[PDB]
């Protein structure tokens, strides 16, 4: 019946480029490591804080040196109500994370640019798939 | 003839933390700002120096002591500098350059704070010559 976005904010941000400025002397042959996960917390009546955790690490291959590492905790407070257990699970692990992704994308993008590295625009992520992992991992725990 | 050129401006490290969200948003916004600053230089080539501006910012709410947010920025730049006497060069590396880097760091701090949806924080101008007089002694 109701899904409303109350507030979008960042809880934690980190960007590091340890090997500057010499790393810019190496051949830009980037190898991208991308980690992602989500977590929810009830913060009030029908109020949930959904947090999208994104970790990105880029290294140059013909050297292994780290170009930059970027970790972001993008969050949003949502008003959610009127959903069956499964509908709600999909909303918290897919729908909401998906609304927060583009904001995290831009944050990562912004930080990478500040290090003067070539643009990094995270490719779209299918959260439905993460939702399926949640289910499957639950059909496993509830079955012990 | 002396020369001072900007080769590159980049960020070496950034950190922004908002521990007590979203509940901190319920307290009365009575901010107490802690601001730390420092600079460091390193020659990275012939006439090439990397000047680094370190800025640390911590804001707490007074009637609770809770941390609203912590933000640390390591703003840097590679400059081409040559033709200056020991004193002239020291002023250039501890005042001139850091001063060119400041507005960049300022914008990064404001950008991050706004992302935590906290009211705007635009660091006040810093008189780096005060940091030069200290360096000399």
């Amino acid at each position: 019946p109701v899904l409303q976005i109350q507030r979008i904010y960042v809880k934690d941000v980190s960007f590091e480029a340890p090997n500057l400025p010499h790393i810019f002397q190496q051949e830009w042959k980037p190898k991208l490591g991308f980690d992602l996960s989500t977590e929810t917390t009830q913060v009030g009546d029908d109020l949930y804080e959904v947090v999208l955790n994104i970790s990105v690490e880029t290294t140059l291959e013909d050297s292994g040196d780290v170009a930059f590492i970027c970790e972001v905790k993008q969050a949003g407070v949502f008003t959610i109500s009127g959903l069956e257990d499964v509908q709600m699970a999909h909303c918290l692990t897919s729908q909401c994370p998906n609304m927060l992704f583009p904001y995290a994308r831009e944050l990562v993008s912004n930080l990478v640019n500040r290090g003067t590295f070539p643009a990094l625009n995270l490719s779209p992520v299918n959260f439905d798939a993460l939702f399926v992992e949640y289910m499957n991992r639950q059909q496993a725990e509830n079955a012990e | 003839q002396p020369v001072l050129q900007i080769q590159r401006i980049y960020v070496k490290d950034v950190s922004f933390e908002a521990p007590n969200l979203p509940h901190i948003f319920q307290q009365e916004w009575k901010p107490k700002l802690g601001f730390d600053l420092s600079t460091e230089t390193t020659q990275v080539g012939d006439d090439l120096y990397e000047v680094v501006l370190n800025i640390s910012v911590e804001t707490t709410l007074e009637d609770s002591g809770d941390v609203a947010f912590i933000c640390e920025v390591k703003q840097a730049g590679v400059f081409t500098i040559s033709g200056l006497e020991d004193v002239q060069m020291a002023h250039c590396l501890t005042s001139q350059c850091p001063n060119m880097l400041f507005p960049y760091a300022r914008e990064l701090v404001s950008n991050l704070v706004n992302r935590g949806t906290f009211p705007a924080l635009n660091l006040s101008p810093v008189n780096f010559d005060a940091l030069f007089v200290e360096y000399m002694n």
Partner: peptide, 24 residues
């Protein structure tokens, strides 16, 4: 263990500025 987390060695250093550094 996040890059911002407190390094697991009570240095007070952040993981990334202590045991997690990647400088070279």
């Amino acid at each position: 263990i996040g890059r911002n987390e407190p390094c697991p060695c009570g240095s007070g250093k952040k993981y990334k500025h202590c045991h997690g550094s990647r400088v070279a």
